[PDB]
Amino acid sequence: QGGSPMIEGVDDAKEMAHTRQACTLLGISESYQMGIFRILAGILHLGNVGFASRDSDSCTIPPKHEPLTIFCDLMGVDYEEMCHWLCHRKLATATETYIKPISKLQATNARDALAKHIYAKLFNWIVDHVNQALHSAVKQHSFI
């Protein structure tokens, strides 16, 4: 979107070197990093999902959509359930819970919200791991 993928004077490979070095130093194993990268790749592949709208209120993802299949494979989750819940939503009324398809623009907004929430949860999980790495068993008399 920005049109400038690279930063002048900044090398991304060395920044991965520093990131992996730091995470290993603070106790995070390479498995956690690899899972984070898998989540990032899944979100990137999900960002390319195209929606075919049956009408204003109902839309269905085109069948055998390769981006969604790759997203599910990278997430290690089912494809059909994710397709149904990205084309339809469960609405719970005061007495009944039914399934109603979503709007295509609302489908895209929901996909964006899902990606954002997954990214935020991953960031918070990394923060919590850094915390448990940095947590001191000895009681802190004070702090700065």
Binding site: G35, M75, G76, V77, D78, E81, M82, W85, R89, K90, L91, A92, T97, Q106, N109, A110, A113, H117, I118, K121, L122, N124, W125
Partner: peptide
């Protein structure tokens, strides 16, 4: 306004990813 359903939260908890419910 972020449109999130409790039923959708349960469905995401049901996702096959072994860390995703841990995230949630």
């Amino acid at each position: 306004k972020d449109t999130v359903f409790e039923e959708q939260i349960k469905v995401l908890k049901s996702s096959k990813f072994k860390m995703l419910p841990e995230l949630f």
